[PDB]
Amino acid sequence: QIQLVQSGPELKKPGETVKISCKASGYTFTNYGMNWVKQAPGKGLEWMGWINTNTGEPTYGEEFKGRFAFSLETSASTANLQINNLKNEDKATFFCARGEDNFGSLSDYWGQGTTLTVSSAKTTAPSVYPLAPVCGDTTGSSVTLGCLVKGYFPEPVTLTWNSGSLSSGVHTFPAVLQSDLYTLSSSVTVTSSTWPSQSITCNVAHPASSTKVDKKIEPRG
Amino acid sequence: DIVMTQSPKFMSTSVGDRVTITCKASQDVSTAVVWYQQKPGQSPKLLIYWASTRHIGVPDRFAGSGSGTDYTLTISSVQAEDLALYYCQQHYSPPWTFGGGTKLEIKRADAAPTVSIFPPSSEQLTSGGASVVCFLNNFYPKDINVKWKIDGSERQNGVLNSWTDQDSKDSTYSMSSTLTLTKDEYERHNSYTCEATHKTSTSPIVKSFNRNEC
Structure with missing residues (x-):
């Protein structure tokens, strides 16, 4: 319209x-x-x-x-x-x-x-970092996993926990600038039945630097 | 220039209840007051004009009023999704001046944070940096203090915090608290802690870690 x-x-x-x-x-x-x-x-x-x-x-x-x-x-x-x-x-x-x-x-x-x-400031492209938990049962039969997207300039950054698919229980936080660059992060909570069972992946795209990353949060524990 | 003034700038109502947001022009502006709404991180939507005429398809629960220099918008049966900034504009003579915007918080009952701490990615440690992330998810009220403690000593600095704005669906807030040490300072220590004090508990809500298998 x-x-x-x-x-x-x-x-x-x-x-x-x-x-x-x-x-x-x-x-x-x-x-x-x-x-x-x-x-x-x-x-x-x-x-x-x-x-x-x-x-x-x-x-x-x-x-x-x-x-x-x-x-x-x-x-x-x-x-x-x-x-x-x-x-x-x-x-x-x-x-x-x-x-x-x-x-x-x-x-x-x-x-x-x-x-x-x-x-x-200059364009810096990011550091996508998979944060698997030090186990820690994050509430009864749930696990929260995370993705720290550090060191980029300028804002924006597109973050999708698996191609748009983990949609409920995601918290992407606003980015904050530390003088020259930003630091952004997201969390996602899943039931224990789903992880390490399926593949949760942080699909991060920095469009200013032609950067697209998919850090798999691999179980490391 | 006609000055539009809004006070207060933050407002809290419960669900299903009512709020009245006062706006005030600095001369008689003859009901030529528009109210816009800007849903968190979107455009404004023209809600009402001439003090009470609703624009096309805003639901009749948004009612405005006024005369002279004193106008007010009322929202009844406040949906969890009316959380936004409301703005009065003047529409009488140039230039079109706005009011500061009033933020409408939704007043949920309490929740307690699902706190959770994260060690460095091995990947980052390889880069020679060490960030320790602590999320504190879905708490109500908004007032949460988080302290980082390495080896029982307080650590005020190297921390960056960010709060999600209130959740439109389940009226709650959430926050990252990030500690960023040097690989050496990190690899020189052992007990990392994220403690949170909130209305929900007197006793510190505390999460600590050093690496172990599970």
Whole structure:
């Protein structure tokens, strides 16, 4: 129905330039305008301005008049935020949303967001480490096994305990940055009947470094 | 610019109960208040506009109200999945200003953490590093302290913690606590411990290990 899928997350060293694309479907592009919003982590949601997909004319908000530039590939129904000279406080997530009415007071149907990690840091690819237990019956007739995905940059990382299949009783924890890199981990609990019996495998993909790992949590005990 | 102000910023209701989230503009904004909802790590969804008009297909259990500079969103029969941040926006005159967002915690009864400690992967020890992971899974309330103790001595540092945000399904929290030593410091010791104090028990919930077969 309306779906606005956006570009994937972007890493860019300070002072650089980025064009974040947003492709519309469901509606007639020209009769609804694009609203762009900044959800910066420790602060909240900010309107950036709005563009008229019929005339092409952008409005900008005060805090955005200057490096932000709205542009549109009408012909493919795409709005793009271009940010120039990436001052570090542009580390945030940018949502494009369809402005219902004229000027975009009502944003109904939002896009999934794109995350700009403005950073001097280098891409480091991860260390996927199978954590089999020192046995320890983790609750009656259950065992919890783990997967430490250390030392990578930038975020994200896709983690699936066996190709999407161990779905219930998984806890992937948020990643945390230790100055230059992140450390992420997941747990999964299974009944004793299932492990070491079947093959639980950590299927970790670092898409920035073209890295896909499958560490089998082998019984080691 | 019209300033929208929300207080408090965190709220806790039980399941099936009610919450009222106050929002407040700094001048009469004539019911031109929109409420969005941002489910943990998703887009906002426009819930209501003009103070009480529900958008297409939000269930009638979300009711808004207001006048002047004082508006409020009420949620009744709070589903475990209403855990999200609620945001008021103003929709009267430019620019469209938002409120800080109020986080809605769901108030489950207590649980106690399924604590579990992990030795280094042999693999990591081969890399010359030694992380000792302790998971503490599915506890309620949110307030858990974990200390690492190597050889009965406290170890405050080298630790990284991360909490899962509250679980939408079974309203609980969960946390990794990671200790990262040098292969030598690791290979110089023997009793590693992860102790957790939580509302669920007076006596420390403690998991310790040194390698043995099972």
